[PDB]
């Protein structure tokens, strides 16, 4: 009939403890606010999980701009001649490379420039 | 290297601590003079601790004068739960807090 839940609850708590990396001086061992602190941490990072890809959307968006603009035309334009496209449509790694191989991009820029005018 | 340690000490963990924090990672002799003419309580207690430490030291752990303190720390422990006036109702205690005294003697 004995229910010495012991060893047990201690266990879980250390559990959440491990959940507990190092964070703010205090939830650091706050055997409770610890727990909570977690709860939020978590939902949070979830939110982060989907967010991220966007932040990137932008990220590229810019390295991007550095380049498209560099040559002499905005994303309105790029995107357009670009879509005139046909056997080629690619946006992500684009910029990355404007960086990575000057020419590669260059070229790209050209063909596109023309895509347009 | 060898050391000095005493529990069931009846003193200010804290204040005690300033004492040591100061005779600190420094010369045996020198700090010795530090406990010697330094103010506040413990001073004594501490200097004692040192004495036992270095004695302990060249006697059976062994080069007298090249020794200094290699580290020093105090740790609070068993309490002295003091029962004072009831809230002119419910007692109110205050704990004298026994203090643990530890110091390292090591040659140069």
């Amino acid at each position: 009939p004995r229910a010495k839940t012991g060893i047990v609850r201690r266990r879980r708590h250390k559990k959440v403890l491990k959940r507990a990396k190092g964070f703010w001086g205090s939830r650091s061992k706050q055997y409770r606010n610890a727990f909570q602190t977690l709860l939020n941490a978590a939902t949070y990072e979830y939110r982060d999980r989907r967010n991220k890809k966007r932040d990137f959307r932008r990220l590229w968006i810019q390295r991007i701009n550095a380049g498209a603009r560099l040559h002499g035309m905005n994303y309105s334009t790029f995107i357009n001649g670009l879509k005139r496209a046909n056997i080629d449509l690619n946006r992500k790694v684009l910029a990355d490379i404007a960086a990575r191989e000057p020419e590669a991009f260059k070229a790209l820029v050209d063909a596109s420039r023309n895509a347009r005018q | 290297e060898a050391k000095a340690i005493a529990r069931y000490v009846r003193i200010s963990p804290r204040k005690v601590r300033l004492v040591v924090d100061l005779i600190r990672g420094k010369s045996l002799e020198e700090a010795r003079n530090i406990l010697r003419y330094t103010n506040k309580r413990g001073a004594y207690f501490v200097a004692k601790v040192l004495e036992s430490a270095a004695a302990n030291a060249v006697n059976n752990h062994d080069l007298e004068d090249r020794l200094y303190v290699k580290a020093a720390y105090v740790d609070e422990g068993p309490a002295l739960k003091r029962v004072l006036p009831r809230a002119r109702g419910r007692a109110d205690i205050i704990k004298k807090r026994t203090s643990h005294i530890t110091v390292i003697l090591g040659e140069k």
């Binding site: 977690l38 080629d88 690619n90 | -």
Partner: protein, 100 residues
């Protein structure tokens, strides 16, 4: 020795440094195997051409290992008396870049 292709997604900028890859339970299985991924990023030894110019040839890599969801924990919470939880899923077989 660096080319940029794409696969059931981008995952790309590769050559020989086997770049872990999405699931593809249909051709994988095939242990050390060769497989064709269509180009669209011929950037090689300082000469690049259109991705469609490409859309014709490409390459192959060697199907190489089975990667089991590198751990990542999901704590499902909301003040809203809502708590549930699960760990990752994602996984992928590694293939080494075979350039042509």
């Amino acid at each position: 020795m660096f080319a940029i292709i794409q696969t059931g997604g981008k995952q790309y900028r590769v050559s020989e440094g086997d770049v872990i890859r999405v699931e593809s339970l249909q051709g994988e299985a095939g242990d050390k195997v060769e497989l064709k991924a269509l180009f669209v990023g011929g950037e090689q030894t300082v000469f690049g051409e259109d991705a469609g110019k490409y859309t014709v040839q490409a390459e192959v890599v060697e199907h190489g290992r089975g990667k089991k969801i590198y751990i990542r924990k999901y704590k499902s919470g909301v003040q809203y008396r809502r708590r549930t939880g699960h760990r990752q899923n994602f996984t992928a077989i590694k293939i080494l870049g075979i350039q042509g």
